[PDB]
Amino acid sequence: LEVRPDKVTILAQAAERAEDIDVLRAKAAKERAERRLQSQQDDIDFKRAELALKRAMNRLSVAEM
Amino acid sequence: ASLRDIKTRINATKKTSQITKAMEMVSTSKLNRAEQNAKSFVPYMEKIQEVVANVALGAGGASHPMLVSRPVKKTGYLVITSDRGLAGAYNSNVLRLVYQTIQKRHASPDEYAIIVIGRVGLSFFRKRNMPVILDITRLPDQPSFADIKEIARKTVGLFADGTFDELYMYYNHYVSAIQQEVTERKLLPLTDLAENKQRTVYEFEPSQEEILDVLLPQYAESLIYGALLDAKASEHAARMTAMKNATDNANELIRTLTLSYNRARQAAITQEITEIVAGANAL
Amino acid sequence: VAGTLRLDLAAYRELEAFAQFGSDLDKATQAKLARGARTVEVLKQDLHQPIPVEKQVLIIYALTRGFLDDIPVEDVRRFEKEFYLFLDQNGQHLLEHIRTTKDLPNEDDLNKAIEAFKKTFVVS
Amino acid sequence: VAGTLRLDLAAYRELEAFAQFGSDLDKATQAKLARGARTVEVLKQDLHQPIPVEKQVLIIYALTRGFLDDIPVEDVRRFEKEFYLFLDQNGQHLLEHIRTTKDLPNEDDLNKAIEAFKKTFVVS
Amino acid sequence: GLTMAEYFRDEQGQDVLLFIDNIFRFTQAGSEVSALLGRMPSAVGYQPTLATEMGQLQERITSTAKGSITSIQAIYVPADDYTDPAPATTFSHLDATTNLERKLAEMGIYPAVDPLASTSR
Amino acid sequence: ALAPEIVGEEHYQVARKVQQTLQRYKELQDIIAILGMDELSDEDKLVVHRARRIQFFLSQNFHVAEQFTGQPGSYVPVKETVRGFKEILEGKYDHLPEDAFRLVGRIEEVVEKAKAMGV
Amino acid sequence: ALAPEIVGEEHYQVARKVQQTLQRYKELQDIIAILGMDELSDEDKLVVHRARRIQFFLSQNFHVAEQFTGQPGSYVPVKETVRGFKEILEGKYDHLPEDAFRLVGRIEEVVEKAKAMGV
């Protein structure tokens, strides 16, 4: 809590307008799986492109000339 | 060589150039989003810094352990590295600098502990049998404060337990889309601090000594979060630059291939016409 | 009518290579990718079935004016097949005007006819 | 015996392409890579040194049955030479049976002989 | 055409312009004539007398003490190869080069002559 | 004449190892020219590091070229060059710059050239 | 001769769908071999589920091979094979084992083979 005669400012690490702690915990639990699956999707998206680049590069070495 | 071989080589390098261009575009878009993601953090930091500067720098306040430099017995290290490659010497510079500093100024395995972020750094430090105490991997492209909280508070508590007396941070600072620099920053015991131009006394409640115990760890965690965001931005920029360089190299090679293509094309005809004429002249 | 079809085809041919490697592109590319596929689908044809010039002009105009931006790609052929019958049933005055004058009909009237046909049509 | 050797060699040759650079592979593929490396190492031969078929079949069988997975790569040639020396004075009945019948003997005797030789051998 | 043009500078004594629509057709027709006559071919199948045939035509366009003739010529550059013998032989007589740009034409600048590609001796 | 029974086991092994390293270095040119040295693994970096040193050490200075450069030249015995190549392959001289291996003759002169350069 | 004016609309559509699904299946070879069957979407998994069935049903047993196996062989009409492929594409046999589609002939023999297998 930071209070000034001009303004009042509250520094918090998490906030919610629903006034309920339980719904905040439920929201955190819901967001956990969402961020986990987002990270997995990003990893697989990068890996597919890496495999495609490797396959493309192999053909130059195959073509010895 | 052979005309068909030259044609196949040209096709292959064209395919590689196209793939590299697509990767460059993707990296550019990701960096564009990451810039706004990093920018969205200013007000909280600019307020907490002012509050800490106003509170700590007044009527002494040196009784807190996190404000006095006790004698050094153990040292900590924090390293921030990416999880995926194709970024150049981004990880190599930081790893080399950290290794050189440790080897220069420690010369003993029991004088330090290492905390790392990223699979590349984790593997690099495990290959040398160096001691690692904490590590987290597989972070999202645009992480939030909800994933670094546990490791940040664990590090703060580890320092508060007296395991080590000081630690430093090593990461890349995003200067420009083409320039990135490695920086070393001292996190705690925060012996050096700057005061605000305007300061006002506060009515402590319930106690000035009790306020600092809750105030300080949030400041440290905010510093760590800002450093992580900067590192992510620098990584994206480096990846984009590397992809652009690869495209340029392939485009350079194509024409040098085409010249020999043309020479072989002329040679084939000049051989075949002479052969036909010589065969016809026999009768 | 045929002014912008060349540009749309060129843009789709240039941008079609990078579609499979990501979806984080800017919103401008999405419109190009959505329009190129529909143009390619419209450009197809069957065997031994010539199409009148007036009908070709009308369908290409409908493509170029963005009336097909909401129709799914899979139903373009059936949409065109039903639109030909609808034009035969009710677009006789527009077809006669096109045949006589070698020029486009009233834009408001043809837009109203297109809207009526779109209301009649059902997406599968 | 030759079929599984051919399959292993083909799999190793196909899978070796993706290990040039970039991210590392998994242990399931690393086991195949190690098996292929051992297969390639075994096939090497010296100059003017013919080898009898009754010993070739035995060494290839020992390769294909997985008895060589515990031995480092650098010791394969010495292991093969010592195995030939051991077979020269022990297990001659197996060689006689192979020569007479053109077929493999019972698998128990081969397994116990290989285990005894593995116990006798010393890894450098 | 050249002997039509020469008369004005030889007698009247004035500067004359000469235009050749395409020069590659001349060389290809000479090659066809040589093949019909039945001489042995050359490096890339052309006629043995390509250089002298080109010279005998390019040497009559000069400036005298009482007149001059200058020519503007168009070249095809087949197969987009600049080392082809016919373009190589034609390029040995040129003194200037002008280029036209479709980008400038679209932008609306006329005569859309490229200011960077054009060179002059 | 390159046979184990004519030249020697050590010479044969050293020559075979040098040829193998040179071939393996040659096989990576396509990747190096495009993607650079960053994507290589730990073994490939060491292979390139030693291959460059071997390639530079293969050079020599002659007596005839003295009249154009002023360098007297050298005469190198077979045992000396074999020992030098074996020591290089063993990784003893990995900390010296690669420019010190050019036109040096014997292995011992590499160290003095490096210390004259300032390493 | 693979044109709708000669073979028929149903035959043309069935052949086109089979070709499309086989071509789609072929593109996942490297991804499957490297990263395993996991990380795949729910659609590609069904595609590879049906592609194996189609590929195995494409086989047949011959009359001349009876002397080595004891299987008499069969002669399959175009209408029967088209109907069987249409049913497979529709998916009436998604629960049958994979090995039941090997060397059967008509579609109705797959059910008998599966019943003999104990399904």
PDB file of C-alpha atoms in Angstrom, chain A residues 50-51 53-55 57-58, chain D residues 17-18 21-25:
ATOM      1  CA  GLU A  50      14.459 -27.486 -37.903  1.00  0.00           C
ATOM      2  CA  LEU A  51      13.769 -30.939 -39.367  1.00  0.00           C
ATOM      3  CA  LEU A  53      15.881 -27.338 -42.842  1.00  0.00           C
ATOM      4  CA  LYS A  54      18.008 -30.403 -42.067  1.00  0.00           C
ATOM      5  CA  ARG A  55      16.321 -32.408 -44.828  1.00  0.00           C
ATOM      6  CA  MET A  57      20.467 -29.195 -46.380  1.00  0.00           C
ATOM      7  CA  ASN A  58      21.205 -32.923 -46.720  1.00  0.00           C
TER       8      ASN A  58
ATOM      9  CA  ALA D  17      21.704 -38.131 -42.144  1.00  0.00           C
ATOM     10  CA  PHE D  18      20.021 -36.109 -39.375  1.00  0.00           C
ATOM     11  CA  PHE D  21      24.330 -30.723 -36.783  1.00  0.00           C
ATOM     12  CA  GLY D  22      21.501 -29.046 -34.907  1.00  0.00           C
ATOM     13  CA  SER D  23      19.580 -30.514 -31.994  1.00  0.00           C
ATOM     14  CA  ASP D  24      20.521 -33.899 -30.565  1.00  0.00           C
ATOM     15  CA  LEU D  25      18.443 -37.031 -31.081  1.00  0.00           C
TER      16      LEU D  25
END
